[PDB]
């Protein structure tokens, strides 16, 4: 369903964190890992465009009542909540051969 709705940008967060556990296991069937790699790469490009639209919508979330570091810490947390997801997805793909499969799926 997520490979069907890859242009369907409304995506639940459950389907990716459940398929990452399908990537992490080794005794499963190899055909499930293709769709697991597809939903993982879809969440990766969704996190990338979420980071781009967070960086583009910069001056709406800034409050002048704070200091120069509190707004910086808030923006750093808002960016790290997308960066750690990509750091988890690529670390899950590191322990399998599906990280090569998303390379051919993207190209």
């Amino acid at each position: 369903n997520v490979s069907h709705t890859a242009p369907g940008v409304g995506i639940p967060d459950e389907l990716v964190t459940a398929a990452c556990c399908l990537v992490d296991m080794s005794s499963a069937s190899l055909e499930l890992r293709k769709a697991a790699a597809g939903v993982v790469g879809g969440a990766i490009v969704h996190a990338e465009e979420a980071l781009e639209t967070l960086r583009s919508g910069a001056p709406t979330q800034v409050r002048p009542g704070h200091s120069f570091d509190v707004a910086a810490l808030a923006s750093a947390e808002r960016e790290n909540v997308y960066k750690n997801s990509i750091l988890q997805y690529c670390a899950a793909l590191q322990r399998s051969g599906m990280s090569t499969h998303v390379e051919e799926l993207w190209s």
């Binding site: 990338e48 990509i86 750091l87 988890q88 690529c90 670390a91 793909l93 590191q94 993207w106 190209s107």
Partner: peptide, 27 residues
């Protein structure tokens, strides 16, 4: 349009500034 650019994972990791050794040792 940058259609000849690589669409692998490595440029995404270098945009975030991480190597694959850091991703093997993070969790």
């Amino acid at each position: 349009a940058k259609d000849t650019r690589r669409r692998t994972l490595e440029d995404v990791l270098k945009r975030l500034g991480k190597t694959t050794r850091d991703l093997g040792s993070i969790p």
